[PDB]
Amino acid sequence: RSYPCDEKKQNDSVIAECSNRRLQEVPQTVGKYVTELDLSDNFITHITNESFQGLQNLTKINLNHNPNVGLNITDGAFLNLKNLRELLLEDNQLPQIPSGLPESLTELSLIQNNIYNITKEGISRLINLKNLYLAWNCYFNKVCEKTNIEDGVFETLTNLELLSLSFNSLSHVPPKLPSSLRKLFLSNTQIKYISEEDFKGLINLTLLDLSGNCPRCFNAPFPCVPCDGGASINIDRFAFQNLTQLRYLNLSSTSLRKINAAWFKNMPHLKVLDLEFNYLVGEIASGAFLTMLPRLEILDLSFNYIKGSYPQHINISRNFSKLLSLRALHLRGYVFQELREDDFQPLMQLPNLSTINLGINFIKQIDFKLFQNFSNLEIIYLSENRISPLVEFDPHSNFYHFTRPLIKPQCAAYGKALDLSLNSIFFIGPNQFENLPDIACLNLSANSNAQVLSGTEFSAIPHVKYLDLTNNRLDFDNASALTELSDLEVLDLSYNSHYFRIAGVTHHLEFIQNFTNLKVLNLSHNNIYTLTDKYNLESKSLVELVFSGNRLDILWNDDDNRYISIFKGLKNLTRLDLSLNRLKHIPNEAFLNLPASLTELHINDNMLKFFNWTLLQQFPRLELLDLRGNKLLFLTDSLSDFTSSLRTLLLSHNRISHLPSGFLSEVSSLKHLDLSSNLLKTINKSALETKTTTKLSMLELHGNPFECTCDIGDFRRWMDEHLNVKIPRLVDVICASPGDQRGKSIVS
Amino acid sequence: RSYPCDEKKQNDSVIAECSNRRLQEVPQTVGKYVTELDLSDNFITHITNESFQGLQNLTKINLNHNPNVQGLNITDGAFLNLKNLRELLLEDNQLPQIPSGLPESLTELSLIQNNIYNITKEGISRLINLKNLYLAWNCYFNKVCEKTNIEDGVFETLTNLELLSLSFNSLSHVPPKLPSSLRKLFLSNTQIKYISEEDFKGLINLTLLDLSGNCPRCFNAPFPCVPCDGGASINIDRFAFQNLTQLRYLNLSSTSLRKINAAWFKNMPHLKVLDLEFNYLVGEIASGAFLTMLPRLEILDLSFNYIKGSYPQHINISRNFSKLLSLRALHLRGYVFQELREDDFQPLMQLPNLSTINLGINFIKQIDFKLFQNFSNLEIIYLSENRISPLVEFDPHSNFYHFTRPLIKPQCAAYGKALDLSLNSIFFIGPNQFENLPDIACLNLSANSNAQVLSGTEFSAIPHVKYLDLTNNRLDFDNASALTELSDLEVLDLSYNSHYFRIAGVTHHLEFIQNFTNLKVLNLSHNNIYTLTDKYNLESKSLVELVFSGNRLDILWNDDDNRYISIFKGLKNLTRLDLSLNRLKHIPNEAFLNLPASLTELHINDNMLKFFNWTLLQQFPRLELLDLRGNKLLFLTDSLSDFTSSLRTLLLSHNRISHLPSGFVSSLKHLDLSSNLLKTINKSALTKLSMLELHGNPFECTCDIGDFRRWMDEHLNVKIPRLVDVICASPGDQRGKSIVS
Numbered sequence A: 001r002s003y004p005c006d007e008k009k010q011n012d013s014v015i016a017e018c019s020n021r022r023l024q025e026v027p028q029t030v031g032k033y034v035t036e037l038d039l040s041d042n043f044i045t046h047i048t049n050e051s052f053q054g055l056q057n058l059t060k061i062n063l064n065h066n067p068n069v070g071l072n073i074t075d076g077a078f079l080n081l082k083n084l085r086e087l088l089l090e091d092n093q094l095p096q097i098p099s100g101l102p103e104s105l106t107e108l109s110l111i112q113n114n115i116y117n118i119t120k121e122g123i124s125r126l127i128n129l130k131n132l133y134l135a136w137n138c139y140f141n142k143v144c145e146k147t148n149i150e151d152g153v154f155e156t157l158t159n160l161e162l163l164s165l166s167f168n169s170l171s172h173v174p175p176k177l178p179s180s181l182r183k184l185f186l187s188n189t190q191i192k193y194i195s196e197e198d199f200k201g202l203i204n205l206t207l208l209d210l211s212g213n214c215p216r217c218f219n220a221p222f223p224c225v226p227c228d229g230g231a232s233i234n235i236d237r238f239a240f241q242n243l244t245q246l247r248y249l250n251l252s253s254t255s256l257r258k259i260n261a262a263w264f265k266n267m268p269h270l271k272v273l274d275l276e277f278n279y280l281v282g283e284i285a286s287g288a289f290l291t292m293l294p295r296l297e298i299l300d301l302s303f304n305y306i307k308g309s310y311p312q313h314i315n316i317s318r319n320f321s322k323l324l325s326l327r328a329l330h331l332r333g334y335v336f337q338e339l340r341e342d343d344f345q346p347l348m349q350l351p352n353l354s355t356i357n358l359g360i361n362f363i364k365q366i367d368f369k370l371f372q373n374f375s376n377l378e379i380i381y382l383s384e385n386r387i388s389p390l391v392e393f394d395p396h397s398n399f400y401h402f403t404r405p406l407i408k409p410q411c412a413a414y415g416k417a418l419d420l421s422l423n424s425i426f427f428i429g430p431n432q433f434e435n436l437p438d439i440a441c442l443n444l445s446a447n448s449n450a451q452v453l454s455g456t457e458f459s460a461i462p463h464v465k466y467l468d469l470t471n472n473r474l475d476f477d478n479a480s481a482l483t484e485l486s487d488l489e490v491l492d493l494s495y496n497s498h499y500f501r502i503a504g505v506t507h508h509l510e511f512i513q514n515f516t517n518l519k520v521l522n523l524s525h526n527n528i529y530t531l532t533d534k535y536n537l538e539s540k541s542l543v544e545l546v547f548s549g550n551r552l553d554i555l556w557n558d559d560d561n562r563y564i565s566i567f568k569g570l571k572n573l574t575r576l577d578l579s580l581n582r583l584k585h586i587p588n589e590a591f592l593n594l595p596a597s598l599t600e601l602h603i604n605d606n607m608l609k610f611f612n613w614t615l616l617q618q619f620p621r622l623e624l625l626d627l628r629g630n631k632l633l634f635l636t637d638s639l640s641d642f643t644s645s646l647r648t649l650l651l652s653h654n655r656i657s658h659l660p661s662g663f664l665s666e667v668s669s670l671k672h673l674d675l676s677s678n679l680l681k682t683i684n685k686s687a688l689e690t691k692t693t694t695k696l697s698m699l700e701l702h703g704n705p706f707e708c709t710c711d712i713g714d715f716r717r718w719m720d721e722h723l724n725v726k727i728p729r730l731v732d733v734i735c736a737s738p739g740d741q742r743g744k745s746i747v748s
Numbered sequence B: 001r002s003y004p005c006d007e008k009k010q011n012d013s014v015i016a017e018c019s020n021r022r023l024q025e026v027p028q029t030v031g032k033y034v035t036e037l038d039l040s041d042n043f044i045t046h047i048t049n050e051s052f053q054g055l056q057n058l059t060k061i062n063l064n065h066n067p068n069v070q071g072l073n074i075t076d077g078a079f080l081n082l083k084n085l086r087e088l089l090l091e092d093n094q095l096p097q098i099p100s101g102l103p104e105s106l107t108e109l110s111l112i113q114n115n116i117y118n119i120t121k122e123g124i125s126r127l128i129n130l131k132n133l134y135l136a137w138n139c140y141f142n143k144v145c146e147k148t149n150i151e152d153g154v155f156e157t158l159t160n161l162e163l164l165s166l167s168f169n170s171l172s173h174v175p176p177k178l179p180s181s182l183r184k185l186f187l188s189n190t191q192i193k194y195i196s197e198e199d200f201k202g203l204i205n206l207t208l209l210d211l212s213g214n215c216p217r218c219f220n221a222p223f224p225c226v227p228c229d230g231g232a233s234i235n236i237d238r239f240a241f242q243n244l245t246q247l248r249y250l251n252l253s254s255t256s257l258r259k260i261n262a263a264w265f266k267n268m269p270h271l272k273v274l275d276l277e278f279n280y281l282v283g284e285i286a287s288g289a290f291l292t293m294l295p296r297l298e299i300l301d302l303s304f305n306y307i308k309g310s311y312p313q314h315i316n317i318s319r320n321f322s323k324l325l326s327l328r329a330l331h332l333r334g335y336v337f338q339e340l341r342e343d344d345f346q347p348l349m350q351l352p353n354l355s356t357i358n359l360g361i362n363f364i365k366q367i368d369f370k371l372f373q374n375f376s377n378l379e380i381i382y383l384s385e386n387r388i389s390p391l392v393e394f395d396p397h398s399n400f401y402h403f404t405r406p407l408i409k410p411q412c413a414a415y416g417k418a419l420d421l422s423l424n425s426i427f428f429i430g431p432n433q434f435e436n437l438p439d440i441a442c443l444n445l446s447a448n449s450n451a452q453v454l455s456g457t458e459f460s461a462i463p464h465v466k467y468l469d470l471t472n473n474r475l476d477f478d479n480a481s482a483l484t485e486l487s488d489l490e491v492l493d494l495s496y497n498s499h500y501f502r503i504a505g506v507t508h509h510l511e512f513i514q515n516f517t518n519l520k521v522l523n524l525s526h527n528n529i530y531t532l533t534d535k536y537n538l539e540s541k542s543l544v545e546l547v548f549s550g551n552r553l554d555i556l557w558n559d560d561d562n563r564y565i566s567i568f569k570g571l572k573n574l575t576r577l578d579l580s581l582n583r584l585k586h587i588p589n590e591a592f593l594n595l596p597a598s599l600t601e602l603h604i605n606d607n608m609l610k611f612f613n614w615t616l617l618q619q620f621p622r623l624e625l626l627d628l629r630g631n632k633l634l635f636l637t638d639s640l641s642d643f644t645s646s647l648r649t650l651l652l653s654h655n656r657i658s659h660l661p662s663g664f665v666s667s668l669k670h671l672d673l674s675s676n677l678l679k680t681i682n683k684s685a686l687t688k689l690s691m692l693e694l695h696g697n698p699f700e701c702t703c704d705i706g707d708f709r710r711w712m713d714e715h716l717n718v719k720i721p722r723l724v725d726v727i728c729a730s731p732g733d734q735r736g737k738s739i740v741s
């Protein structure tokens, strides 16, 4: 097996992963046929022309974040690598562009360094460069020099498609840029003025990022320097006249008050326009520029609020009706009190508008009937408002917003999604969900809802398939709760412990049995320790129950038989999570009453000192058993007699100091065994060896206190004989003794 | 030195604490002059006449919870040679019988939580000096157990017996022939359905009688509950308590009572505490003829007497509650009613000593708060866990039917009148919310789903609040004048109000902290604070303690950001600062140097610090406690005396320190290096040092441990706790043993 790297052939190329292995130098034991080498997050301090000596087929090298506790690179160190195309050298404290880089380079990343001069000696010979990243070298309150770009430095790069110079002090757009450019990033570069000459001849440019130039600095979560008097970026009327192929334009945080419509007259394919963190409330109301954007699919006008103004309504121009290709509209942080039906008339005839994002607007009232008149809304995102009852910075990420999905894909897969989470809908009245479309995914998480659901609250939206009611104070005091949602498949009641933790009040979970199609139920972190009248959970359909963060230590108290069959009635259950239940021991009768249909059982992060392995005989379909983070001291020596279906056995973070002789004899089905972070001093050959067919492909042993005397030789010989079983984190499978090998890996 | 027990002389008697040290047998290395020995929570399986050999002055032995799983076997007359043994605790030992041949000198015997189903003369009649006898919790709930047989006249010879507890046992009848010396008789959950005139005859010295759980109210019981035939009441004869003239405590909780016979208290002039929780007494609370017979009553508990299925508009209390002149506390939880009007509590307003009113868990929606002004001297108004909205396993030595903990935190109640409105729905505090309230000094509004922007006017009608708890809300700190109307505020708790702080796009204002002239304690824990608007610094001339745990100083002290570099410098009087749980991998030197120089206690535990610049302790001449536990520190400075001459406590447990430097000062009393990677302590490293913790280190017990062992013998003044957990990791033949073996 390879060491220190994890070498894998996927598919024509051979990849070597040597990241985060505290390597002081590049290892001279890397496979000769490796093509892509990842040495990021190590303590490597020096690179010479001998560092990559016998690796002639090397096309990619990643030396990011080296050292971790600056990287010294000699001139022409990678010059013998005639096949090197991609070289990542980010966060290396490099003071200059390395001299003598190979002419074969197609991608070069020098992000997060101290490089303040872009010179011809450094990059003019790299005529094959397609992607060049020099972002985040001088920014924020970092002590750094102004970025000098030598005249015509990028001119010879006739194949350059991507150039990123963001988060550097430039002041001006660098002149003499190659016409082959497709993507030009100049975000946070202190460029206050864009003339007609700056983007001249860039007829192939599909993306231009000019965000953070003359930024809007009020309430900035980062060091922010505005232009003189909080002034706007000055973009000439003809600045984008040759940008005929532009698809992406980012003007976020450029302190814009006006959008010149003439900017888009020669830009017929503009698809994505970011105008977040500007002063465009006036332009949103009048919007002459909206008539010039027929192909636009994504428009972001978030956080354009006027400081000190909380208006009653949102003023949307009738020209929003000209955005025929619009798919998503982001209007977060506009800030207004009420959304009326007539306010969104300009968007109601757009055929592909599937997403409307109105989060963080402090909205108190909404006429929900307005969403019905839309052509085909699929995501109505109203999270984080004040709706009451109806009466450090990652350089390869978006700096001004999270690119994550608004709704969970598992919820949105069912159909129309309505997100009303993080609001104040503390009580759902009889007409709360009146006049809403056929909502399939509904999120009412964190609404301070302390009501007793009784089977009538969701009757106007009866086709909800995924319901999220997490982080509320729900009072489960009625057996008919949620039963009106006949087709409900996923129900999340996590973090509704308020009333469950009070013994004196009544608790009713009988409604679970009345669903014919309920598949997933999450009752996590509810502190459930007592139920009224019905002590059992029953369901002919339920497939998964998450019961983590409850009190099975109390429910399965030795002197109490009432909750002994609490899960037996879940006749179709395949996945059960009993983690975080403070279980010191599970009664044998309680374990025997778990559904026999179980394929995955999690009992991790409890306090189990013992586990009766014999009881696995009554679970003929158990594939995954997870007992991590317990206090188990012993393992059974005849697991084959108790199970013939177990594929994954997780036992990490326990107190197992001995692996029984013949532990894996005749098991056959076991593929993954995790014994990491236990107290194993050694592994005897007999504890792993087998006389039957073995499907063991993964064995984890990192974090065990291994005594590296000659007694560890039988295990090392076993490792050499069984290359098919992968032992991950081989550098963390460290010797604890003797002294002369205390920090070394087992392989030595 | 002591091993395995922690022997201490406090004051005339010598105590030995050997609890929870996985002892397989009683240790033969206990001090000869020990008087009280605690061997509870061990794996001891056998007790013989040789177990306590040479411990002649032993007056107390506690062998509770032994064995604590992989029953205690006691030979007949095992403790018979101990001529001074008075107290013997043998709880949770799976004992099938009362041990034979127990010594006649016993004054207290506890056999709680065993399998003893027969109380025989051979077992206890010779124990004529017994004052306290506990035999509770031997047969109860769904435990498989036999009915409790009490031999006739078994307690008769115990002429000095003052306390007898037989609770949580199947008795069916009150045992006859009880000694007249009895003061306290516990018969809770004993299946005694009827009390006749003869049962408590001649018990003229009885001060306490507990008959709770006999014919229990079983609806919504958090434990196995068997009601009497048809949910019937306990049947207590009119003259059952005729001779109980000295009764001070009477517990009739969960006896399914519908009527209280007033004649029960005609010969009971000193009754002080009466528990009537979990009964069916809504009718008796409204009419209450028995209330005229209770002039000396100080505590009355009528909790959880609600009618199932009835949520009335009002609470009906009888005018006879005005006859409870000695009343100090009234508990009316679980009565269940919608609104509390001012005329509803008129019968209590002239009671002089009524300092506590407890109305928790009643589902109250509205209260006329002006009603509490007319009370003589209410000190605790407990309204927690209701539905108040804006103005238009079982421990045997604990109370089974309620928590005996204080209703309010003593630190809050020490300032004066306390009003607890926690766990309610006061999501917004309007202008007249606190109108007509008394001079409230301690206010708790924790967990009220309050998402409002406090602006400096919400608490103007109660301006003398000194301790304010606003924990577990969604408060929007968006106004510099918040809480400034509380000009005498000393303690402010804003823990768990992260809702708006976690959103970068909304504004966050903490400037109000500087405007308080007497603010002493401020808790901003678990607020996820990572960004502030306009003012990046916390300032206060008075603040003494700041709890900033569970925030994001890793983001605030980002290397490329100087805005929060002096975030705490302006807290000029700060002595205690908690920076735990802030995900700090490193603290910039400039940020550490800007911490208040007045600090005496600095906690930076449970972060991810890989390095700590010890040199910077020079700018903290008053630092007494430095807590760096639960970090990833690998190294310690070799010249701590040059950086500090005031440090008394240094906590470094749960780090990755594998070596103690040479010369490891005079001010240091407590050094905690437990749960680190120390293999040995060399002669180079080896004074006010009185405590040194080293448990959980992987000690190589081979050669250099002899030097540390010699140092331990030379310095008996420094205590090393948990000596059984200071275990050898190597070699194999001593892998589980303590280093002192």
Ligand SMILES: *[C@@H]1O[C@H](CO)[C@@H](O[C@@H]2O[C@H](CO)[C@@H](O[C@@H]3O[C@H](CO[C@H]4O[C@H](CO)[C@@H](O)[C@H](O)[C@@H]4O)[C@@H](O)[C@H](O[C@H]4O[C@H](CO)[C@@H](O)[C@H](O)[C@@H]4O)[C@@H]3O)[C@H](O)[C@H]2NC(C)=O)[C@H](O)[C@H]1NC(C)=O
Pocket: A408, A409, A410, A411, A470, A490, A492, A494, A520, A521, A522, A524, A544, A546
């Ligand atoms: C209350 O309880 C519910 C039920 O458990 C929780 O919801 C589930 O949360 C889990 C964990 O986030 C979800 O599982 C994850 O789904 C991801 C997406 O799956 C898609 O892609 C896979 C292929 O990768 C498709 O087969 C599938 O059909 C999906 O459309 C996966 O990417 C996740 O990773 C898996 O693989 C990786 C290895 O690649 C492993 O490391 C992971 O451990 C895992 O095996 C993962 O499977 C699950 O989908 C959710 N279910 C539902 C119904 O939503 C709630 O989150 C919980 N609530 C709270 C508040 O905690």
Ligand SMILES: *[C@@H]1O[C@H](CO)[C@@H](O[C@@H]2O[C@H](CO)[C@@H](O[C@@H]3O[C@H](CO[C@H]4O[C@H](CO)[C@@H](O)[C@H](O)[C@@H]4O)[C@@H](O)[C@H](O[C@H]4O[C@H](CO)[C@@H](O)[C@H](O)[C@@H]4O)[C@@H]3O)[C@H](O)[C@H]2NC(C)=O)[C@H](O)[C@H]1NC(C)=O
Pocket: B384, B407, B408, B409, B412, B422, B423, B444, B445, B446, B447, B469
């Ligand atoms: C305003 O009103 C609110 C709401 O009623 C009050 O909040 C309660 O405050 C109390 C006291 O601080 C809280 O009780 C504490 O709970 C902690 C967490 O629970 C533990 O439970 C078990 C043990 O039963 C543990 O195994 C488990 O790991 C949990 O962490 C406890 O840790 C606390 O224990 C304290 O006492 C023990 C000794 O008994 C010590 O060993 C501990 O070190 C510690 O000192 C404690 O029990 C309670 O949870 C709060 N309730 C809610 C709903 O928040 C406010 O106190 C009140 N404010 C004022 C001013 O009165």
Ligand SMILES: *[C@@H]1O[C@H](CO)[C@@H](O[C@@H]2O[C@H](CO)[C@@H](O[C@@H]3O[C@H](CO[C@H]4O[C@H](CO)[C@@H](O)[C@H](O[C@H]5O[C@H](CO)[C@@H](O)[C@H](O)[C@@H]5O)[C@@H]4O)[C@@H](O)[C@H](O)[C@@H]3O)[C@H](O)[C@H]2NC(C)=O)[C@H](O)[C@H]1NC(C)=O
Pocket: A383, A406, A407, A408, A411, A421, A422, A443, A444, A445, A468
């Ligand atoms: C209904 O609406 C609610 C509310 O909007 C939705 O709830 C959110 O759901 C998402 C997706 O599940 C949650 O995101 C998770 O966040 C986890 C991180 O949480 C913290 O704790 C970690 C340690 O336990 C810690 O590592 C982590 O820090 C790191 O990441 C942070 C960014 O994620 C970063 O700021 C830190 O610097 C650090 O790098 C966290 O602080 C993460 O582990 C999960 O993978 C996941 O991303 C949100 O937290 C939920 N929000 C709330 C308010 O509850 C819900 O999904 C909606 N339901 C549906 C059906 O769509």
Ligand SMILES: *[C@@H]1O[C@H](CO)[C@@H](O[C@@H]2O[C@H](CO)[C@@H](O[C@@H]3O[C@H](CO[C@H]4O[C@H](CO)[C@@H](O)[C@H](O)[C@@H]4O)[C@@H](O)[C@H](O)[C@@H]3O)[C@H](O)[C@H]2NC(C)=O)[C@H](O)[C@H]1NC(C)=O
Pocket: B409, B411, B412, B471, B491, B493, B495, B521, B522, B523, B525, B545, B547
């Ligand atoms: C927010 O931060 C607050 C400030 O730290 C937290 O309040 C503090 O909590 C600590 C820990 O519980 C308390 O300290 C304990 O006090 C008790 C009692 O001390 C007093 O009484 C004893 C006699 O019983 C007496 O000997 C003392 O001298 C005291 O006067 C001690 O027994 C403990 O060992 C420990 O010292 C603080 O008292 C308390 N401060 C205040 C002002 O309340 C608060 O809990 C935090 N909030 C949350 C939600 O976590």
Ligand SMILES: CCC[C@@H](CCO)Nc1nc(N)nc2c3ccccc3n(Cc3cc(CN[C@@H]4COC[C@H]4O)ccc3OC)c12
Pocket: A305, A306, A307, A308, A309, A310, A333, A335, A360, A362, A386, B453, B455, B476, B477, B478, B479, B500, B505, B506, B507, B508
């Ligand atoms: C993107 C949100 C950014 C900030 C900007 C504030 O410069 N807004 C808000 N930030 C926070 N943290 N909270 C709220 C908030 C809570 C409830 C209802 C509306 C709310 N807004 C909206 C808003 C309100 C005002 C009136 N607030 C005054 C001052 O304090 C007493 C009130 O009387 C003025 C402008 C305004 O947004 C433009 C905010």
Ligand SMILES: CCC[C@@H](CCO)Nc1nc(N)nc2c3ccccc3n(Cc3cc(CN[C@@H]4COC[C@H]4O)ccc3OC)c12
Pocket: A452, A454, A475, A476, A477, A478, A499, A504, A505, A506, A507, B306, B307, B308, B309, B310, B311, B334, B336, B361, B363, B387
């Ligand atoms: C000590 C509390 C014990 C239980 C007893 C329940 O027999 N009460 C409650 N237990 C919980 N968990 N919640 C609530 C609750 C929430 C809001 C307002 C009042 C509330 N009560 C009070 C109560 C209500 C009814 C009406 N309930 C029906 C059923 O479902 C629809 C409602 O219309 C009848 C009797 C009654 O108390 C006796 C309770």
Ligand SMILES: *[C@@H]1O[C@H](CO)[C@@H](O)[C@H](O)[C@H]1NC(C)=O
Pocket: A049, A050, A080
């Ligand atoms: C490395 O480069 C140096 C000159 O900088 C040269 O002397 C040496 O021979 C080179 N070695 C290899 C392996 O290329």
Ligand SMILES: *[C@@H]1O[C@H](CO)[C@@H](O)[C@H](O)[C@H]1NC(C)=O
Pocket: A046, A072, A073, A074
């Ligand atoms: C890089 O190190 C080499 C020696 O390994 C030396 O010749 C060169 O000058 C160093 N450069 C810098 C900037 O340290």
Ligand SMILES: *[C@@H]1O[C@H](CO)[C@@H](O)[C@H](O)[C@H]1NC(C)=O
Pocket: A096, A116, A117, A145, A146, A147, A148
């Ligand atoms: C330009 O390169 C020279 C030579 O290394 C250096 O002195 C100068 O500082 C560089 N420019 C900037 C702005 O750093």
Ligand SMILES: *[C@@H]1O[C@H](CO)[C@@H](O)[C@H](O)[C@H]1NC(C)=O
Pocket: A179, A180, A204
């Ligand atoms: C524009 O890009 C194409 C490749 O897509 C290339 O052939 C063409 O020469 C480029 N134009 C200029 C002027 O560089």
Ligand SMILES: *[C@@H]1O[C@H](CO)[C@@H](O)[C@H](O)[C@H]1NC(C)=O
Pocket: A282, A285, A286, A315
């Ligand atoms: C709405 O926007 C239009 C277009 O700019 C403007 O004329 C009108 O005054 C605005 N009205 C309000 C109340 O904002």
Ligand SMILES: *[C@@H]1O[C@H](CO)[C@@H](O)[C@H](O)[C@H]1NC(C)=O
Pocket: A324, A325, A326, A351, A352
């Ligand atoms: C609308 O969306 C569909 C599906 O994504 C696409 O094929 C179509 O061309 C789009 N039309 C317009 C007008 O945007």
Ligand SMILES: *[C@@H]1O[C@H](CO)[C@@H](O)[C@H](O)[C@H]1NC(C)=O
Pocket: A454, A455, A456, A478, A479, A480
């Ligand atoms: C649930 O509430 C409805 C009224 O909303 C009522 O008809 C039903 O009886 C309640 N369930 C119970 C068992 O109280």
Ligand SMILES: *[C@@H]1O[C@H](CO)[C@@H](O)[C@H](O)[C@H]1NC(C)=O
Pocket: A455, A479, A480, A483, A514
């Ligand atoms: C459960 O389903 C049955 C059959 O459809 C129905 O009769 C019953 O009323 C439902 N229960 C509730 C509480 O709605």
Ligand SMILES: *[C@@H]1O[C@H](CO)[C@@H](O)[C@H](O)[C@H]1NC(C)=O
Pocket: A516, A517, A540, A541, A542, A543, A572, A574
């Ligand atoms: C049982 O669960 C399976 C999925 O594992 C599902 O296909 C089936 O329909 C469920 N049966 C019932 C009765 O709901």
Ligand SMILES: *[C@@H]1O[C@H](CO)[C@@H](O)[C@H](O)[C@H]1NC(C)=O
Pocket: A588, A589, A612, A614, A615
């Ligand atoms: C495992 O469970 C069986 C069946 O309840 C029981 O007979 C056996 O003793 C259990 N094993 C242990 C060690 O408790």
